[PDB]
Amino acid sequence: AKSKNHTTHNQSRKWHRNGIKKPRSQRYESLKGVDPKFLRNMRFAKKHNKKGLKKMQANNAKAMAARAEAIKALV
Template identity: 65%
Template sequence: MVNVAAKKSAGGKGAKRPGKQVLKGKGGKVIKVSKKSQLKFNIDCSHPVEDGIMNCDDFKTYLQTRIKVAGKTGNMGKDVSLGREKHRITLSSSVPFSKRYLKYLTKKYLKKNNLRDWLRVSKNHTNHNQNRKHHRNPTRKPSAKTQYKMKGMDPKFLRNLKFAKKHNLSHAQQVKKAAAK
């Protein structure tokens, strides 16, 4: 399962905070500069890695090559960093970074490695800011009845369709009936 967690941290308790940063614009106008907040995303791959479905190192290298910063790949620098601890990948960013973009890259990696049918990215139940990959059951049973949308169809056609369903036999039933004669 993969958890994608987002946290904003602006120092901790007791951390020294610098004074307000101010820029002077045209005409001596004062423009306040907002503090940089540290974004942190955690991707937990523990369940797929334990099952032997996924390789965490490959996923990390995939993210390193694909993440775009300021519209360019391979431009992470000091702003964005990737770390790995066992089956957890941590992405920390000092520039604006979207959790949806990270989720998109995760889905793209799964599709590339033919794992999209087996795994999905979903929220962690303990923390609302986290996403987790669960195993998906690829063999879903089809429903017994196929439902047709009848709205807007010709009533005469619908009457004929109902009659055909009631009186016509399937191909297998027709073969059995012919063999019995």
Template identity: 75%
Template sequence: GRLQNKMAKSKNHTNHNQNRKHHRNGIHRPKSHRYPSMKGVDPKFLRNLKFSRKHNKKVKIVVADKQPAVKAQQ
């Protein structure tokens, strides 16, 4: 063929050995946390949620019942 000065082709992509590396420690599901993040939630909803929690009397009664009466003993 004709002699041309062309640069060598460079590798564009490879996934070689990645699957083995991923499976070394096992592929796990993401951990589920107790309270999911409210990041990115509708601001109007968050404001209402804040006020509803603030004025929720049932929750306050339950929390007060669970706390030990340390102050009464002193």
């Protein structure tokens, strides 16, 4: 009682019958596997970005008048 032993005959029909779908990419990929010592600092930077907000509010407010400065100088 002998038999077949290996075959890849029909298979490409099976594969394409539902398709061959590349993976679904996204922005904001995942941070699984990166260096610990680098990941650590990212936390500390985000843990303190709240500071500078007033100084940030000033600069981009003045720069908004100074961004108006284009349409001012244009007009």
